[PDB]
């Protein structure tokens, strides 16, 4: 195996395929990247046994076929550390892989390509293409609502669903839920899968924010995404995930509309004097007015009064202010609509100008 | 004092 | 106590005095800021018992004299969280301090101004002024060589010495030493004091390179610096600081000059294959050439060859990577000069174009 490639043609791919690797690999091979030269292409692959990221790099300089695995962090750091424009010559020499550039030389230890973990073959059952920007929107709109190491391991991931002509994501941790739907232009078979936490992170990382379209393939137990010369594949999480349609408040009769930023800034200031652990704030809704109050164990108190559009009966309701701020931060809009029922029921929050995303937050008893 | 959703 | 002032006039002062804080504030009182209104001025003071920072704000709006103390971080966050252009009205009302702006209200807990610790009166014995940029240069040139949590407390700080017409800083952790001196155009008495590391950080913090000079006053047990309308005071550290004059190599006859950036990147790249738990590289010096090599337990190896200017006898000597990189990062000049003696003696490093700073690094056995 032999290849010579310009530093920058190699750097981003190395960075990307290293994504799924941890700071401390359980076993040596998991800290390595698989390098394969075949048919004028160098392929780089990184894995954590649950998912893998592959990059294809075109070789325009002389090369020889073959494969090996070498330490990912070390190889990336070497390439990144070389001068801009450096030519990086690489050759497999049995127990070691020799990297040369200028008068810089590096000998890395190798592990057999035959020993590199490989995800089982699988078949795609649904396929579609969508703009990278749509995938980014879908994930960013709901990722914060995923559980963090919950017993219901399925809540630690994100649900991806195809319906009619839309792709939708759903995340929930039992206290709040986020759902976002986006049209795809294609007619798809109704489908529902759970993508693991690290999988969601990798999907986001592979979006360059360019014109390259995103091609998705979903099987019974895997999801694959292709962008440019990168291919990400992850196993899916098994389990039964909640039906957002049922979690949404049944009859949120009371509707309030308010500027997103004024509401966010008021909650942010009130949060300063809320209980450091429980973070509770009180909302008192009255005709065209919202009063937010917060108090803590030190007898400190914050009060914010805001003009809003509201005509229902008066009511008071408590919330974890961090859950509310998380939603307002995810909604990048001018105005928001809060739909309430009563003090003991969940509230649904959405962009006042779009039903694309919806957030359900359960209240707390102050 | 946090209540939970009916998932 | 009562005052009303623009948020815009409080921001910088608050940041300056609230700085030393956050991490587990010992005495509760130390997490508060002392606020005092007297003769048309609002003074704000923060302290950790070892040092104190005082800021002044002029009051043109109606005000009433008095003093109290309030949670520093909370008061700063409330002020910063209010909208640009906000006016902030503050009044002490018994056990609470009421803060009002627009339709936002905050009631903060207080502690008696009489309880606020203040450094005992002291007397200055040495005074001088110098440019903010000169002080910044003196500190940045040596700060990285101070010890961290060393049982020898006097090394967990920085020596400030006046001699002739220069101000000099010295820092060392017993393995490497940094010294820098700068002329300040004033005839000074010979004096030497040790400023604690936290005080050094704070000093650095109040410097903005303005043409506005820093006024320094040094006493037997304290140091004070006045910059604009901020006054910083810190206790000094007891102990006999080592004499850098006895640390500089006696006759470092072998002089090598190398491009700073090229040497830095060669060290940085070679370090990737050095021992992860204790990173060091071997230098082989020969006529106009430097070879830098690293090895690790995995038998991996790195080699860098650099053209340099050197005409002495050949020698091989090892160094701790971080110590040399720290020096090259602090010099950030075009070329550096390494002055060597032999394989078992420390090296002195300087900017090839300036003798203002000098660094001494012991060799590392590999």
Curated annotation (Swiss-Prot), chains A, C:
Transmembrane segments: none annotated. Coiled coil: none annotated. GO terms for biological process: DNA strand elongation involved in DNA replication. Signal peptide: none annotated. GO terms for molecular function: 3'-5' exonuclease activity; DNA binding; DNA-directed DNA polymerase activity. Residues 1-125 are annotated as: I. Disulfide bonds: none annotated. The keyword DNA-binding applies. SMART domains: POL3Bc (SM00480). Gene3D superfamilies: DNA Polymerase III, subunit A, domain 2. Pfam families: DNA_pol3_beta, DNA_pol3_beta_2, DNA_pol3_beta_3. It comes from the Bacteria. InterPro entries: DNA_clamp_sf, DNA_polIII_beta, DNA_polIII_beta_C, DNA_polIII_beta_cen, DNA_polIII_beta_N. Confers DNA tethering and processivity to DNA polymerases and other proteins. Acts as a clamp, forming a ring around DNA (a reaction catalyzed by the clamp-loading complex) which diffuses in an ATP-independent manner freely and bidirectionally along dsDNA. Initially characterized for its ability to contact the catalytic subunit of DNA polymerase III (Pol III), a complex, multichain enzyme responsible for most of the replicative synthesis in bacteria; Pol III exhibits 3'-5' exonuclease proofreading activity. This is Beta sliding clamp. It comes from Escherichia coli O157:H7. The gene is dnaN.
Curated annotation (Swiss-Prot), chain B:
Induction: By SOS response. A member of the dinB-yafNOP operon. Induced by hydroxyurea. Poorly processive, error-prone DNA polymerase involved in translesion repair and untargeted mutagenesis. Copies undamaged DNA at stalled replication forks, which arise in vivo from mismatched or misaligned primer ends. These misaligned primers can be extended by Pol IV. Exhibits no 3'-5' exonuclease (proofreading) activity. Overexpression of Pol IV results in increased frameshift mutagenesis. It is required for stationary-phase adaptive mutation, which provides the bacterium with flexibility in dealing with environmental stress, enhancing long-term survival and evolutionary fitness. Transmembrane segments: none annotated. Belongs to the DNA polymerase type-Y family. The catalytic core consists of fingers, palm and thumb subdomains, but the fingers and thumb subdomains are much smaller than in high-fidelity polymerases; residues from five sequence motifs of the Y-family cluster around an active site cleft that can accommodate DNA and nucleotide substrates with relaxed geometric constraints, with consequently higher rates of misincorporation and low processivity. It lacks the O helices present in high-fidelity DNA polymerases in the fingers domain. It is found in: Cytoplasm. Monomer. Interacts with beta sliding clamp, which confers increased processivity. Disulfide bonds: none annotated. This is DNA polymerase IV. The chain holds residues 345 to 351 of 351 of the full protein.
